[PDB]
Each structure stands twice: as C-alpha cells, then as structure tokens.
Amino acid sequence: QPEVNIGVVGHVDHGKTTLVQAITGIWTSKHSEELKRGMTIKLGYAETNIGVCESCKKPEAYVTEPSCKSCGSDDEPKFLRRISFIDAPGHEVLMATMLSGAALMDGAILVVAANEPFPQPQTREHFVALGIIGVKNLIIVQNKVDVVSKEEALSQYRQIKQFTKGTWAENVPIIPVSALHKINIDSLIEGIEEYIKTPYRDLSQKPVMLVIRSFDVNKPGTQFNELKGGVIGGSIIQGLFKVDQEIKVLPGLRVEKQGKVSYEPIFTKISSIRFGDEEFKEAKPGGLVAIGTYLDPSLTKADNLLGSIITLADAEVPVLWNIRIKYNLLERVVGAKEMLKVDPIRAKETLMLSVGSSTTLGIVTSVKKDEIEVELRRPVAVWSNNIRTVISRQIAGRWRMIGWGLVEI
RNA sequence: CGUCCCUGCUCCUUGCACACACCGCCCGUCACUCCACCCGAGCGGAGUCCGGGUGAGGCCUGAUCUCCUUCGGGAGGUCAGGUC
Numbered sequence: 401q402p403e404v405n406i407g408v409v410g411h412v413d414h415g416k417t418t419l420v421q422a423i424t425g426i427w428t429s430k431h432s433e434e435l436k437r438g439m440t441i442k443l444g445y446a447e448t449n450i451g452v453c454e455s456c457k458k459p460e461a462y463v464t465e466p467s468c469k470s471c472g473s474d475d476e477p478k479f480l481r482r483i484s485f486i487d488a489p490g491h492e493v494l495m496a497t498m499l500s501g502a503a504l505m506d507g508a509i510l511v512v513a514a515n516e517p518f519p520q521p522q523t524r525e526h527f528v529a530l531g532i533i534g535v536k537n538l539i540i541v542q543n544k545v546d547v548v549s550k551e552e553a554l555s556q557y558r559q560i561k562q563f564t565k566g567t568w569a570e571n572v573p574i575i576p577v578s579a580l581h582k583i584n585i586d587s588l589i590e591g592i593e594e595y596i597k598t599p600y601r602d603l604s605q606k607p608v609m610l611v612i613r614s615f616d617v618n619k620p621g622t623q624f625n626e627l628k629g630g631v632i633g634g635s636i637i638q639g640l641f642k643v644d645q646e647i648k649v650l651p652g653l654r655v656e657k658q659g660k661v662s663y664e665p666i667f668t669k670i671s672s673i674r675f676g677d678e679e680f681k682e683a684k685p686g687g688l689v690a691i692g693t694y695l696d697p698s699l700t701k702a703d704n705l706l707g708s709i710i711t712l713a714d715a716e717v718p719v720l721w722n723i724r725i726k727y728n729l730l731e732r733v734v735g736a737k738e739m740l741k742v743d744p745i746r747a748k749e750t751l752m753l754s755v756g757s758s759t760t761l762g763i764v765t766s767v768k769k770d771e772i773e774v775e776l777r778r779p780v781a782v783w784s785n786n787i788r789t790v791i792s793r794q795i796a797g798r799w800r801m802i803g804w805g806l807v808e809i
Numbered sequence: 810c811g812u813c814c815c816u817g818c819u820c821c822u823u824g825c826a827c828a829c830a831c832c833g834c835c836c837g838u839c840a841c842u843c844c845a846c847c848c849g850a851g852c853g854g855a856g857u858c859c860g861g862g863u864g865a866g867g868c869c870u871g872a873u874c875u876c877c878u879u880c881g882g883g884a885g886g887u888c889a890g891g892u893c
C-alpha cells in the first residue's frame with residue numbers, strides 16, 4: 401500500500417494533473433466526458449514507487465521503478481516507499497471538494513504556472529486553506545518553464561520568494577518543472593523524499609477513515625449470480641482495517657416519513673481490500689483505500705456516501721445536527737480576483753461547513769467573539785474533539801472560504 | 810314567409826362592492842418611494858438572587874498598663890475569645 405497522501409494544489413489549468421501524469425504515468429482519466437472537455441472534476445488518483453540509485457548521483461538517482469541502469473549504473477535502486485497523490489481541481493468554485501480532500505492529506509505540492517501573473521485567485525485561496533488546516537509540509541513548484549524566458553522563471557522566483565516570506569513558508573523549496581516533457585522531475589522526487597516525510601500513525605487507535613468516492617463495480621449488465629458488492633472509496637487516517645471486520649458508516653442514510661428527516665448508521669462487512677490495482681488483506685493510513693462491501697450498490701452508486709466516515713462496528717461517535725464551533729477569520733477574501741474585506745458574521749445566514757471529508761451546509765443561531773453554534777441539514781459524525789473545520793459563504797453566486805476553527809463537543 | 814342571427818329600442822324581472830353610472834370598481838405579485846412603529850449578532854450601565862468574604866461601632870467574656878476612686882465603681886488605652 402501507499403504510505404502517505406500528498407496533495408497537488410494550485411490554480412485552474414496550471415497543470416496539477418499533468419504533473420501527476422509525469423510522476424505516476426497515470427492520468428485522472430479527465431472524464432464525465434465533461435471533464436474530457438473541461439478538465440479534472442472528481443478527485444484524481446495515482447500511485448508509484450520511489451526507489452533510490454545508491455550507486456550514482458542525485459537528484460537523477462531518484463528513480464520511479466526498480467531500475468538504476470538509467471542513471472550511472474545498474475545496482476537495482478533500494479525501494480524507499482510507495483506513495484499516493486490526491487489531485488484537487490483548479491477551477492474557483494470546485495473549492496468545496498479540494499477542502500474536502502484536504503482532510504486526508506499528509507503533505508502537498510504547490511504547482512504555480514511560470515507563464516501567468518503569480519498570485520492567481522485560486523493559487524492563493526488554496527495556499528491559505530493549507531496554512532489554515534495545518535498541512536505544514538509544502539513544496540512549491542514552477543511548472544510551465546518550457547514556454548518562458550530564462551529571465552521570466554527567475555523574476556517569478558523572486559515574486560514567490562517574497563510572498564512565501566511573511567507567511568509561514570520558511571524554506572518551502574521551489575523546484576521548477578516541466579510536467580509536459582517530464583524534465584527536472586527527479587529533483588522534485590528529491591524534494592518530496594526529503595521535505596514531505598512519512599509521519600507516524602498509532603494503529604492501536606480507534607479505526608477511523610474518510611470517504612471521497614464509492615463505486616458500482618457492476619458494468620452495464622453483470623448478472624445477479626456474480627453481483628459483486630458495493631464499493632466505498634476513501635482514506636484511512638487513524639488505525640488499520642482488516643479483511644472480514646464488522647463495520648458502520650455515519651451519519652448514514654435518512655428515512656422519509658411525510659416530510660420528516662432522519663439519518664441512521666448502516667452496517668456491513670469488509671468484503672475485500674485493495675490498493676492501486678493490487679488487492680490487500682489489511683489497510684493502514686496514508687493512501688486512499690477501497691473497501692468492497694456486501695451492501696446494495698444502489699446505496700453507493702454515483703458517489704452517494706460521499707462525505708461519510710467509516711468506523712468500527714460498535715464504536716462511539718456523535719451524529720450531530722447542531723454544533724459548537726470555535727473559530728477565526730481571514731482579514732481578506734483570498735480567492736476572489738477582488739480582495740474585498742471579510743465582513744463579521746451575521747445570525748440567520750447560510751454558510752458551507754466543511755467538516756472532515758463531508759461538505760454540508762448550515763444555519764447560524766448564535767454569534768459570539770469566537771464561538772458559534774450551527775444548525776445543519778445533513779448530519780455530521782464527529783469521531784473526535786480534534787475536528788478541524790472550514791467556513792465558507794456565498795459572496796457573489798460562487799462559494800468562498802472566509803473563516804476556520806475547530807469543532808467542539 | 811317573417812324576426813332566428815348582426816343592430817337599435819320599448820316593457821317586466823333578476824344581481825351589483827358601479828353613480829367621474831362596465832371606457833365602472835378593484836385585488837395580489839414584483840419594481841421603486843412616504844409617515845409612524847417592533848425585534849435584534851452586539852456594546853455600555855443598573856437591579857436582584859445565591860454562595861462566600863470583609864466588616865466599623867455597640868454589648869458580653871478575659872487581661873495587662875494605667876488614671877482616678879467616697880473602695881461601691883467609672884472612664885480609658887491595648888490586646889485574646891464570643892455576641893448584636
């Protein structure tokens with residue numbers, strides 16, 4: 401399995417996906433046909449091996465396969481770890497899925513375009529979302545250096561070295577790439593091998609995991625007799641799951657009784673485990689996993705339990721409707737082309753509460769200095785007291801990050 | 810032939826929220842104004858209740874130093890314990 405989850409953030413079309421192509425060799429598909437004409441839309445996914453050419457010279461020593469005869473000589477590169485990416489989209493309004501994604505990440509790579517005016521609306525928006533959430537392991541990258549002057553990718557490296565200054569990003573190193581022709585990527589591999597280090601996760605902890613996809617393996621027309629189970633798609637964060645463990649999802653499906661609303665936990669067994677294209681018997685944090693189940697795929701078709709969280713069956717997790725956020729605000733709206741000042745929060749207003757991987761909306765009942773209580777629509781399964789959350793508003797038709805904080809229970 | 814349909818008109822009735830007499834009256838939406846008004850994210854100030862803390866003076870218990878005293882007592886310093 402992959403050891404660690406790395407984001408690829410940045411502005412729209414700056415080539416976040418193309419840089420996941422040049423490292424993994426895997427494309428996100430670019431799909432929905434509408435993504436095949438737009439660009440990446442659902443969260444991409446791709447894995448690879450990072451060895452190291454011990455018997456040669458760095459950074460070109462940093463391989464992708466067990467093959468060192470590429471650089472210096474043969475001595476089959478000692479394998480260091482296997483990894484996995486999560487490619488967020490770059491378009492301004494697909495803010496609500498990149499946040500969602502960011503509940504799973506152990507580190508990131510900021511893909512700035514060398515041929516556009518540096519602080520681009522989303523490049524920043526993402527960055528401060530990073531600084532907010534706690535993803536303190538960043539590596540900036542200057543992407544399209546194959547279509548610019550040799551003066552131009554330096555003068556921008558000024559602009560990056562000056563923005564990256566008053567912000568927390570000390571020596572966050574800026575490795576210029578060319579995701580297109582896969583030149584100077586092995587030096588990006590040396591960055592990610594040094595700076596984005598493999599954290600320790602205590603396995604004895606309560607099994608908890610997030611979900612960001614889930615799919616009907618059933619092709620148009622698999623017969624009933626070999627109807628494989630439904631498939632939940634997401635990343636473990638704390639613990640390790642095993643093949644043939646009893647499980648529950650939360651908040652889980654809601655019933656209908658004449659206009660009423662009522663969510664409830666669903667139970668099932670782990671039918672199968674798989675990482676990449678290879679099936680496993682256990683699963684551990686870092687990486688996005690997938691869990692074959694025995695529940696009706698109608699329940700997990702398009703991506704129905706998106707935002708849900710998986711835990712042990714017979715575990716202790718509150719399914720809140722109403723919640724106490726301790727919070728703070730950005731002084732600006734780093735997101736809009738325009739930097740208009742974030743107003744102070746008004747009661748009886750609509751806001752988009754990102755908690756974990758779930759992207760709920762909710763209404764504000766109380767407003768203190770830094771303690772607000774939010775009634776919701778679709779519940780939230782609050783697995784701990786250390787639930788980072790992110791707070792957006794509708795400024796002008798398109799949803800915008802404005803404050804953050806922690807969930808209190 | 811006659812009067813059905815066009816049209817005008819007389820007579821009788823029927824209903825009207827119409828009388829500038831149906832080219833009448835008038836209702837809601839949304840658009841935007843007029844006059845007075847209610848809540849309210851919040852800030853400043855007060856009142857009260859509860860639990861405790863302090864608490865000056867007076868009274869009682871005890872003293873030391875007195876001063877005075879007609880030896881019955883008064884005043885008083887100061888200090889320990891209890892009370893209003």
Ligand SMILES: Nc1nc2c(ncn2[C@@H]2O[C@H](COP(=O)(O)OP(=O)(O)NP(=O)(O)O)[C@@H](O)[C@H]2O)c(=O)[nH]1
Pocket residue numbers: 410411412413414415416417418419439440441487488489490491543544545546547577578579580581
């Ligand atoms: N010349 C040049 N072109 C590039 C480079 N990287 C990507 N491209 C091109 O730019 C286009 C957009 O790439 P893409 O990876 O979708 O950008 P993105 O930011 O990941 N899109 P999304 O917002 O969906 O994640 C592609 O058609 C690709 O061919 C580069 O380094 N040099």
Ligand SMILES: [Mg+2]
Pocket residue numbers: 413415416417418439440489490
């Ligand atoms: Mg992309």
